[PDB]
Structure 1
Amino acid sequence: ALLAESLRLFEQVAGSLTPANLTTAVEQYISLKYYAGAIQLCLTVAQQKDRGNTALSWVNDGKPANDSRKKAFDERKICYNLIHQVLDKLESDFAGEPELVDGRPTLAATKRMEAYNVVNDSSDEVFHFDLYEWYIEKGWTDRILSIDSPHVITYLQRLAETDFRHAELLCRFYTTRSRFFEAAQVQTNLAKSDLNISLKDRIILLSRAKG
């Protein structure tokens, strides 16, 4: 009742919380294992700093440098970096612990699912992109694949166009889901590309595409 009412109070002044306070809030939420909630505050503070969604119109146009919309992305990221901060202590506290006693899930495993539902269901896709970019930097490959959101497909598709090693995942994404044609469709269209890819790799691509 205290943490749920604190969350109500924070979301009201979301369009006006200072990064120093928002941090102190998330720091305390983690001490009280209130993972999923703290993530929801940072996501809410993001939207209320930029209601018109300029960080979208900024990234959608693709890296307009020297721009006033840098504020939107930078302020939104202060919250996003805190979401990343929560998700780290989430695994740390429940490190290597199993998601069940026989029959019953742990409450540790519950706070895990509660946390990753806030993340995967959000409608802020600029947050999803910054989240997928950060998952790679941590080597959490199999995490990106499991996500069923359609914001991951746009990220991987837009990155496959100029990065061979990202088009690799999009092909892995489709093949774990058994959309085999869609993978060969990319592997072939990638071997025919204008990208800097060795011939012996293009032999692998076409050999996987043929399969």
Structure 2
Amino acid sequence: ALLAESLRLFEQVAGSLTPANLTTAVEQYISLKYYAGAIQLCLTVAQQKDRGNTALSWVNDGKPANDSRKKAFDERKICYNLIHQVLDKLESDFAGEPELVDGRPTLAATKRMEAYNVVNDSSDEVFHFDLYEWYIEKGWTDRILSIDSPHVITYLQRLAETDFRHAELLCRFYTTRSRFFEAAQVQTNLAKSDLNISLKDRIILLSRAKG
């Protein structure tokens, strides 16, 4: 009742919380294992700093440098970096612990699912992109694949166009889901590309595409 009412109070002044306070809030939420909630505050503070969604119109146009919309992305990221901060202590506290006693899930495993539902269901896709970019930097490959959101497909598709090693995942994404044609469709269209890819790799691509 205290943490749920604190969350109500924070979301009201979301369009006006200072990064120093928002941090102190998330720091305390983690001490009280209130993972999923703290993530929801940072996501809410993001939207209320930029209601018109300029960080979308900024990234959608693709890296307009020297711009006033840098504020939107930078302020939104202060919250996003805190979401990343929560998700780290989430695994740390429940490190290597199993998601069940026989029959019953742990409450540790519950706070895990509660946390990753806030993340995967959000409608802020600029947050999803910054989240997928950060998952790679941590080597959490199999995490990106499991996500069923359609914001991951746009990220991987837009990155496959100029990065061979990202088009690799999009092909892995489709093949774990058994959309085999869609993978060969990319592997072939990638071997025919204008990208800097060795011939012996293009032999692998076409050999996987043929399969």
TM-score range, shorter chain: over 0.9
Residue 112 of structure 1 and its aligned partner are, at CA, apart by 0.0
Residue 167 of structure 1 and its aligned partner are, at CA, apart by 0.0
Local SS of the residue matching 2:183:
helix
Local SS of the residue matching 1:23:
helix
Residue 52 of structure 1 and its aligned partner are, at CA, apart by 0.0
Task: Write the distance in 2 (CA, Å) between the matches of 1:111 and 1:71.
Answer: 33
Structure 1 residues 86-132: Cα deviation after superposition (integer angstroms, max 9, x where no partner): 00000000000000000000000000000000000000000000000
- Relative to the length of structure 2, the TM-score reads 1.00
Residue 63 of structure 1 and its aligned partner are, at CA, apart by 0.0
Task: Write the distance in 2 (CA, Å) between the matches of 1:98 and 1:47.
Answer: 35
Residue 160 of structure 1 and its aligned partner are, at CA, apart by 0.0
Task: Write the distance in 2 (CA, Å) between the matches of 1:8 and 1:145.
Answer: 34
Task: Write the distance in 1 (CA, Å) between the matches of 2:116 and 2:145.
Answer: 14
Task: Write the distance in 2 (CA, Å) between the matches of 1:134 and 1:108.
Answer: 24
Residue 193 of structure 1 and its aligned partner are, at CA, apart by 0.0
Residue 50 of structure 1 and its aligned partner are, at CA, apart by 0.0
Residue 70 of structure 1 and its aligned partner are, at CA, apart by 0.0
Task: Write the distance in 2 (CA, Å) between the matches of 1:45 and 1:178.
Answer: 38
Task: Write the distance in 2 (CA, Å) between the matches of 1:154 and 1:43.
Answer: 20
Task: Write the distance in 2 (CA, Å) between the matches of 1:147 and 1:13.
Answer: 31
Task: Write the distance in 1 (CA, Å) between the matches of 2:168 and 2:119.
Answer: 24
Structure 1 residues 11-53: Cα deviation after superposition (integer angstroms, max 9, x where no partner): 0000000000000000000000000000000000000000000
Task: Write the distance in 1 (CA, Å) between the matches of 2:110 and 2:188.
Answer: 42
Residue 195 of structure 1 and its aligned partner are, at CA, apart by 0.0
Task: Write the distance in 1 (CA, Å) between the matches of 2:137 and 2:201.
Answer: 24
Local SS of the residue matching 2:178:
coil
Structure 1 residues 166-186: Cα deviation after superposition (integer angstroms, max 9, x where no partner): 000000000000000000000
Task: Write the distance in 2 (CA, Å) between the matches of 1:116 and 1:72.
Answer: 24
Local SS of the residue matching 2:159:
helix
Structure 1 residues 141-174: Cα deviation after superposition (integer angstroms, max 9, x where no partner): 0000000000000000000000000000000000
Task: Write the distance in 2 (CA, Å) between the matches of 1:26 and 1:129.
Answer: 22
Task: Write the distance in 1 (CA, Å) between the matches of 2:174 and 2:37.
Answer: 32
- Relative to the length of structure 1, the TM-score reads 1.00
Residue 209 of structure 1 and its aligned partner are, at CA, apart by 0.0
Task: Find runs of 4+ consecutive structure 1 residues off by over 4 angstroms.
Answer: none
Q: How many residues align structurally?
A: 211
Task: Write the distance in 1 (CA, Å) between the matches of 2:34 and 2:205.
Answer: 45
Structure-1 residue corresponding to 2:79: 79
Structure-1 residue corresponding to 2:90: 90
Task: Write the distance in 1 (CA, Å) between the matches of 2:19 and 2:170.
Answer: 35
Structure 1 residues 56-88: Cα deviation after superposition (integer angstroms, max 9, x where no partner): 000000000000000000000000000000000
Task: Write the distance in 2 (CA, Å) between the matches of 1:57 and 1:145.
Answer: 26
